[PDB]
Amino acid sequence: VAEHTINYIDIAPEEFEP
Amino acid sequence: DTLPVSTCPAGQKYDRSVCYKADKIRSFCVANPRSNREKITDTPCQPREICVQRNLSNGKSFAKCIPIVDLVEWKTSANGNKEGCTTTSVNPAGYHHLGTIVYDINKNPIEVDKISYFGEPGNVNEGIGGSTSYFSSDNFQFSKSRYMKTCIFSGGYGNLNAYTWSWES
C-alpha cells in the first residue's frame, strides 16, 4: 500500500492549455 | 486555486508562467517584436498553498498554487547524495500524471540531479528527469492495486522540500 493518497487532480484551464 | 495572471498589455500575449518562489507565481507576457517592455506579473499564493510547475502539451511552462493539503509534501534525504522516495495512490482509478517540484529553505526552486517515477507493483519506469527543479511522470493507470513511487536524488544539498501532486491534461 502507498504511504499517501491524493484526492485532488489538477487540470490547467483551457485559456492556458487550448 | 491561485492561478497565474493571463492578462497582458495591448500588443502583448501571455506566454508562460513559472514558480518564482514556493509562494509566488510569475507570469510572462511577450510582445511582437520582443521588447524589454514585456509585462512580468508576480502573483502571491495564499499561505496554505504551494506553487507547482509543469510543462503544458505545447511545451510551455505553467505554474499555479495548490493547497498543500491537496498534494504530498515530503523531505528529500538528509544526505544529498542518497536517493529517497515516497509512494502515492491517486483517487479515483484512472489515468493520471504526478508532478514534483523541489524547493530549498529560502523558498527558491532548486535543481536536483534526478527525479524518477516508478509504477508499482513492478518498479515500472514511468519517467526520469534530470538537472531540473520540477518533473512530471508518464500518464499512468492508477487503481486500488496500482500506485506510483517518486524518487529524488538531489546530488547536492539534502533535506529539500518536495511537493508531489496529480494532474491530467
Numbering used by the authors:
A (entry chain C): 29 to 46
B (entry chain A): 58 to 226
Paper excerpt:
We analysed the cysteine spacing of the other SIX effectors and found that SIX6 and SIX13 contained a cysteine profile like Avr1 and Avr3, suggesting that they may be FOLD effectors. We subsequently generated SIX6 and SIX13 models, downstream of the predicted Kex2 cleavage site (SIX658-225, SIX1378-293), using AlphaFold2 and obtained high average confidence scored models supporting their inclusion in the FOLD family. To validate this experimentally, we produced SIX658-225 and SIX1322-293 (hereafter referred to as SIX6 and SIX13) as described for Avr1/Avr3 and obtained crystals for both proteins. While the SIX13 crystals diffracted poorly, the SIX6 crystals diffracted X-rays to ~1.9 Å, and we solved the structure of SIX6 using the AlphaFold2-generated model as a template for molecular replacement, confirming its inclusion as a member of the FOLD family. Despite lacking an N-terminal helix, the N-domain contains five β-strands held together by three disulfide bonds with an arrangement, identical to Avr1 and Avr3. The C-domain is an eight stranded β-sandwich that is stabilised by a single disulfide bond (unique to SIX6 compared to Avr1 and Avr3) connecting the β7 and β12 strands. Like Avr1, we identified regions of the pro-domain within the SIX6 structure (residues 29–46), despite cleavage of the pro-domain prior to crystallisation, but only within one molecule in the asymmetric unit. For structural analysis, we used the structured region of Chain A of SIX6. Despite this, AlphaFold2 models were critical in solving the structure of SIX6 and SIX8 as templates for molecular replacement. This negated the need to derivatise our crystals, a process that we had struggled with for SIX6 crystals, significantly reducing the time and research effort to determine the experimental structures.
Plant pathogens secrete proteins, known as effectors, that function in the apoplast or inside plant cells to promote virulence. Previous studies of Fol-infected tomato identified a number of fungal proteins within the xylem sap. These secreted in xylem (SIX) effector proteins represent major pathogenicity determinants across different formae speciales of F. oxysporum. Currently, 14 SIX effectors have been identified in Fol consisting of small (less than 300 amino acids in length), secreted, cysteine-rich proteins. Here, we demonstrate that despite their sequence diversity, the Fol SIX effectors can be classified into a reduced set of structural families.
